[PDB]
Symmetry: D2
């Protein structure tokens, strides 16, 4: 048995009645419990994430099967059997909190590894490429996909206007308008790092790397019809499914694979290996198994742990570095930036965000300083041998720059259409029919000029693709 109390620790005499002038009179200002309780209720909410607002979290463990020391000095990958705790958040993208999990969208697949050398965030999606290749375009892309700023309803005419004028999107749309645009749930789902990263070993040798998560539950997708049937009765089915599997002991898992590519292979590929609109061939760059992640624990509080979770692609650990991918480069900035706004300057002290590794530095103060700081010395260099100092064993690599000027210019070999065609031809006939169907339903109401340009981009990917879509939309493409 426990007393209800105020936040001052005073036991509450009456949690039912306001303080009033007699039993039916107006309410007095001197009712600290009422005002405190209502005032905190009035401040429960924080801004939702600007994208990926809808999602669900879980904790688990990553275990190494094959040590990666030949290729990276990353501590958490250094030996067979090494276990690292994770927190993972899965998500949709475009719509707000509360939106259904039956909508078409990439799915987020964000993994935080609590390593001995710091927290490493691999902020992935299910699909292995993206719509754009430069972060400067991201608020534009998002804005076109988001509900219309007047109507508050998503409008295909808007995002297809953007996408069609942004032909590098063509590969991505060829994945997203398959039925893999609606995963059945978060467990029966692919994961991808999407970007190329750099792996750096103890000799300072660098390889390019891509990451892939393969579900133990397999990949399963929903047709537009299957999605509607679920949406009718449950707008949070994926969140429900994740929690329920874990509560029942049916723990979902993913095997982590990598592809590894020499830096020098740039110059002979007909695409840029750091163009995130591109995948690498699995015949030429085979998947190499690293280990397995099992999710086995539900959070204790959704707001405190899942809503407040902060991941960033710039949370890199020794041995794992960014590539020059211009999309990734903006993400390095944007995540901690938005987090400072969404969560507070001190967001890294929220428990789910805290490292397991020691934190010692000369930062101070900021809203909601709860960590009981002490000491006189908050500056470096200083005369004190016991105060924290830099450790040169932990310098990052020095990537070679091939450019000689500060420029704003598109990458060479954009090759916007080739892999979209390859993906299209890789589909089964049943999968091609679904792609055309889903695209037709999406395009049939859009501005005729935009609809033609869409068809033309898919035609440039593959002639059969573009002709089938034109036929299905009733568009005459003879004059082109």
């Amino acid at each position: 048995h426990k007393n209800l109390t105020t936040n001052q620790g005073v036991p509450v005499g009456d949690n039912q009645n306001s303080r009033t002038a007699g039993h039916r009179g107006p309410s007095f200002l001197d009712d600290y419990h009422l005002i405190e309780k209502l005032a905190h209720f009035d401040r429960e909410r924080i801004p939702e994430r600007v994208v990926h607002a809808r999602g669900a979290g879980a904790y688990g463990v990553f275990e190494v099967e094959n040590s990666m020391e030949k290729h990276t000095r990353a501590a958490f990958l250094s030996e067979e059997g090494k276990q690292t705790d994770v927190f993972v958040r899965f998500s949709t993208v475009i719509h707000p909190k509360g939106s259904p999990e039956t909508l078409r969208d990439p799915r987020g697949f964000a993994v935080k590894f609590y390593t001995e050398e710091g927290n490493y965030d691999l902020v992935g999606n299910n699909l292995p490429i993206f719509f754009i290749r430069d972060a400067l375009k991201f608020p534009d892309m998002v804005h076109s996909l988001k509900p219309d700023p007047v109507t508050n309803i998503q409008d295909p005419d808007r995002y297809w206007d953007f996408m069609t004028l942004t032909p590098e999107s063509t590969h991505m749309l060829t994945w997203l308008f398959s039925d893999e645009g609606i995963p059945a749930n978060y467990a029966e789902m692919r994961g991808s790092g999407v970007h190329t990263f750099r792996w750096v070993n103890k000799y300072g040798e660098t390889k390019y790397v891509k990451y892939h998560w393969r579900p133990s539950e397999g990949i399963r997708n929903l047709s537009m019809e299957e999605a509607a049937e679920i949406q009718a009765n449950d707008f949070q089915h994926a969140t429900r499914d994740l929690y329920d599997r874990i509560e029942k002991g049916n723990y979902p898992a993913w095997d982590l694979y990598v592809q590894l590519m020499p830096l020098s292979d740039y110059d002979e590929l007909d695409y840029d290996p750091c163009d995130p609109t591109k995948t690498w061939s699995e015949e030429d760059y085979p998947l190499q198994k690293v280990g397995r992640m099992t999710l086995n624990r539900n959070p204790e509080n959704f707001f405190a742990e899942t809503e407040q979770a902060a991941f960033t692609p710039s949370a890199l650990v020794p041995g794992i570095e960014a590539s020059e991918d211009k999309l990734l480069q903006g993400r390095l900035f944007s995540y901690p930036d938005t987090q400072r706004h969404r969560l507070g300057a001190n967001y890294m002290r929220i428990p789910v965000n805290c490292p397991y590794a020691p934190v010692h530095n000369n930062q101070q103060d900021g809203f909601m300083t709860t960590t009981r700081p002490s000491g006189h010395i908050n500056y470096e260099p200083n005369r004190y041998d016991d105060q924290p100092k830099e450790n040169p064993h932990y310098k990052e690599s020095e990537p070679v720059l091939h450019g000689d000027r500060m420029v704003r210019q598109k990458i060479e070999k954009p090759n916007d259409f080739k892999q979209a065609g390859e993906k299209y031809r890789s589909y089964s006939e049943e999968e091609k029919q679904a792609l055309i169907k889903n695209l037709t339903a999406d395009l049939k109401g859009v501005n005729e000029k935009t609809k033609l340009l869409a068809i033309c981009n898919f035609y440039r990917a593959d002639e059969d693709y573009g002709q089938r879509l034109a036929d299905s939309l009733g568009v005459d493409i003879r004059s082109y």
Copy 2:
């Protein structure tokens, strides 16, 4: 034709490419356009409303048919034909911003009148009563109804635990589990002030008042099955419908009616006329037509106008005052309190929230001061005749207090069950069947002791009501 610019007014040379070390190299920090554009994107979101997060807005006009000056000095009601601009937001209640509009919930019906003596907010719902009668319980009620804080899914076992132990909720639940718990859309929907308010005329005479909005489009409700079928294909159907009606010139309207009751009728009644779990008989207190509101304009920007809209029951105008309703009394505080958090100290300067009537006072500063203040005199009293002064013509009434002590105590004559029974018996057989069906689907999975208490509360309302529910749930109540 216009230049894209930074926020500094510098035309942008290139809105496609980040600044990088050659065409494929990493990104430079000296890219003000990138950083400014990402950083503002990173800050787009504000907190959603703590309740009524999902909603839709429109502007229109309210026109007086019968002047109300014999009963209230309110300026906007003073003359036949007098027109006042309104802004209205409709909403659901429990789930977050992106949640479906097919869910069971009261609907918000919030009307801001831009009167010549200040803004008057009538913050109603469709349903004319509430679950609780004291604001001290509001965070409890809400927390029970909201998604479970662990699972992020709404759980009937939680809110029925609260509601069953809060028997004053019985009248409300008897309305909400009719099919009027799911209005077809926002246009074919009732509105209610819910609370008794005080109307005060130019002689200082006071009457109790209740407000009712009657839709010109009639009232239409959804069954659970009808709601699921809509939910399958559109999770924002009510938002859509409102915008669409107005864009097509099919303007929805409501007639405003009032009931008026003398203060001295308190002892004539077997309930407290200021208990918001109670309605007043329309036979004994007939509806009196006041005027008509027509919504005829969509907002120009949903975030700026609808998301940032702030209504409060305490935005009262001369002639219209709060009653002693202890629920209303807490609302007086909570709304501006939450708005200062959600929107900023200076939220009243946001255009939708601004009055038409002149604002002159000695308040100053606060985040985002955009109003070009001037002058040396920010205090009163002062020696300057031209600075703003109090105006004793605009004093409020002085309600009589019947109590002699500051107490925490439930009102007399709570009468928790009688009107719920009256409402139940007022239903058609088809309506009673839908009530029992909807209750049964909601209660069938809850804790057995809670389920029995629910049945017992409804039995106390009406024996046939409670027995039908018990039969439908398979619960044997012979022995009570």
Copy 3:
């Protein structure tokens, strides 16, 4: 030896050099350490307190010498010898952080007692009365005393305009313009509760109470000349002094005394005993010794503990209640209201603000939730016997209301001049000379009409007072 780390717990390789294109080229965006370290620096500051922005803090102990159980059930005062930890912050009032501690001002004297039944804040000043008697005037008062909103310099013409038109200020001004307006430091300084509070004993009997703190170091004040001399060489001498006394083991102490008055004595006094412009005669209501507070420990971090400290007069404990003092009533609201803005919705979790007594309630979420919440049940009533419940042993008293109606009306018996005259006559001749001298230096440049009104208000206090001021100002008041 310790590593400098990022907030992700990654050791920093180089805390000296930004990451650049060669040894002298422009800086790269991919420099997580630079950006994290700059961004947090960029966010160190929070709003200063709206008043009492300049101050200093210390911890210590309060020990009961005489149990107060005949008069109050407060736990911390129950037993001889009982020791309660305290935190105390002393302050100036008007000017910002960084301002000098040599200025004329009341001084704040805010004591947090960490009691077994919750935190009790006694938020005092050195002077025992105040300028105003209704919180509605506080923003006016402050704005008149604050630097002019155009020039950013304090202007006697502005605050004397307010004070002269606010004749209830006369008693306060008669204390503040003695040399006690500039205490020598925080240790050699009086403290006062200012308001009457209500003490309630185990039988439910109530007495009015006033609190006084008497410095073991005695009271010492600065002349205007002494204050200038200190200001020349140290703008933070009181902060320095408090820290230095404690660091050297010379702990400052205060004895706590109370006056006690029966409720009934209202009706026979020629003032309102809950008017905070009034004192109670020490002859008629003798000081009674309660105990001693000794301050013996400096905080470990000024920002975390002293800057973030939050006190409120509404942090009352069983046995100690607010009086009807209309000034106090507004304070009850204002402090936690400003604190939610200044510090965050969760400011009560900041260590210095935490109670020693257990906190259990159904509040949740809000910015910077750091407390590891858990459990499904965040509402009451609920079916669970182990969840926190109200405890009727801890109900507050039920003060009798003498009023009939909700009114806006000045108290009866304002008696604005009589005590100011009594205070003036209680001064030694040296002390009267100082008062006139300090008043004259303040008023000599003020608007002539305001200057005359000042003289008249002091003349009404005491003829010799007003005449001496008029003489010193060169103002002939014979014609009145």
Copy 4:
């Protein structure tokens, strides 16, 4: 004559009395005027600037004498007689908002030019060099200079520890410990851009540029003793002096001069021309007159205009670009980053911060959206010719990168001591005596090891300098 009103536009009947239970009873919650007025009061303050918190603002005009089009395409410099409106803020550095203006510190000299091609901010100081050359050290340097985080008092032992271990500071300290470390006021003061910038003409030719402001009122300084004499009686003397000069029509002015250097001079010099611890010789790179800035208008409201002013070195206009200076490079980020926290995401819409030039872009939303946004198109590219587009005429230059790797490495030819010695020798004997006096007073109490290292750094600058300081401090340096 005007009514005082609430923020809802309702006239206030009584601005004197709270609403209470009779004339002396406790206060009611239903007092919207009290609560609104106190709530807004409670929220007046925003965070002060993290440095330069104390300052003062004015408006004026800049007029071109000698057009600069041969060297820069900047619009505001394009024609003789061209006038551009400015806003200027002057400041101290280290202590908080209310701190004296008699302290030793650089002075800030921040000029916002409202040009036809956007706002251009030249965020200078009086002194023409800086303590450090990499932004990574800025939070350290500041934390060392700031009041100690335990005592809240500035401690020379802390900042000399930092500075002595940061020998690139030696030139700066040689200026700051002259009497120019305490300017007599803001008018009789030098201004400097400090950094080298790049000027780019219409043919794309680039020169390095330095900016210098020469006061028409001449340069005048205070000795330590003259500063204390002022401080005794006025802790805002420089704020007062600026406002007073302008109010009386005695407008302060500065002539702008530039120095111009070819990029190809790098190897001709024994320092890096982009090292901000360095000046350029005026013999080798003569001062060239541009024009004159006159300050002739005080702001209408200090908070709205001066306190909320936001400047950034990244507010560059076509023709004027950053150099590679690594200190500058971090400032490009830090200012808009801190301003988003201090002022809000929409701080650029605060009037003093608004450009004169048109602003059109696809940014949206954020706290306190006051700008009445409209339209459906918030993304680019789009199909609409009338929506804002990029303008390639306004591309920036493409600086040549000399580096081939991403590195963290000190510049070549740091040359930490030579210019400090040149400055020392440039001093008159009276000036040398002051410098030694001021340094001795500052160093005499610091840790002996730190004090010796200080002397050694000054000795390396000039043997006489170091020897005179050693003699004055009583330190025998014969053994070295």
